[PDB]
UniProtKB/Swiss-Prot annotation:
It comes from the Eukaryota. It is linked to Developmental delay with or without dysmorphic facies and autism: An autosomal dominant neurodevelopmental disorder apparent from infancy or early childhood. Some patients present with intellectual disability and renal, cardiac, genitourinary systems, as well as structural brain abnormalities. In some cases, the phenotype is less severe, has no systemic involvement and is characterized by autism spectrum disorder and/or intellectual disability, sometimes associated with epilepsy. Affected individuals manifest variable dysmorphic features. This is Transformation/transcription domain-associated protein. The lineage of its organism: Eukaryota, Metazoa, Chordata, Craniata, Vertebrata. The PI3K/PI4K domain is required for the recruitment of HAT complexes, and the MYC-dependent transactivation. Although it is strongly related to the PI3/PI4-kinase family, it lacks the typical motifs that constitute the catalytic site of PI3/PI4-kinase proteins, and lacks such activity. Adapter protein, which is found in various multiprotein chromatin complexes with histone acetyltransferase activity (HAT), which gives a specific tag for epigenetic transcription activation. Component of the NuA4 histone acetyltransferase complex which is responsible for acetylation of nucleosomal histones H4 and H2A. Plays a central role in MYC transcription activation, and also participates in cell transformation by MYC. Required for p53/TP53-, E2F1- and E2F4-mediated transcription activation. It comes from Homo sapiens (Human). Interacts with MYC, E2F1 and E2F4 transcription factors. Interacts directly with p53/TP53. Interacts with GCN5L2. Component of various HAT complexes. Component of the PCAF complex, at least composed of TADA2L/ADA2, SUPT3H, TADA3L/ADA3, TAF5L/PAF65-beta, TAF6L/PAF65-alpha, TAF10/TAFII30, TAF12/TAFII20, TAF9/TAFII31 and TRRAP. Component of the TFTC-HAT complex, at least composed of TAF5L, TAF6L, TADA3L, SUPT3H/SPT3, TAF2/TAFII150, TAF4/TAFII135, TAF5/TAFII100, GCN5L2/GCN5, TAF10 and TRRAP. Belongs to the PI3/PI4-kinase family. TRA1 subfamily.
Length: 86
């Protein structure tokens, strides 16, 4: 998962709507426990990418997929809530 996330989250790939749509199909698969874990452990890229509207929307979309199946999480006071508040 380490090499794949760095290639699929690149801005040049995220600009094309077809590439983004195909990626979301992969991320919604139920057998991605070893794949979605690395996304939740790397919030640095999200901060630099969340803060051009379509790219922000894709940042908005990716959050739901990692939260809709991982509700028992995010009980701290980290900056992700602060950026979403802004």
């Amino acid at each position: 998962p380490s090499q794949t996330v760095e290639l699929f989250m690149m801005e040049a790939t995220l600009n094309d709507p077809q590439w983004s749509r195909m990626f979301m199909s992969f991320l919604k698969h139920k057998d991605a426990r070893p794949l979605r874990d690395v996304l939740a452990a790397n919030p640095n890229r999200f901060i630099t990418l969340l803060l051009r509207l379509d790219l922000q929307f894709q940042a908005i979309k990716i959050i739901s997929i990692i939260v809709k199946n991982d509700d028992s999480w995010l009980a701290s006071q980290h900056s992700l809530v602060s950026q979403l508040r802004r």
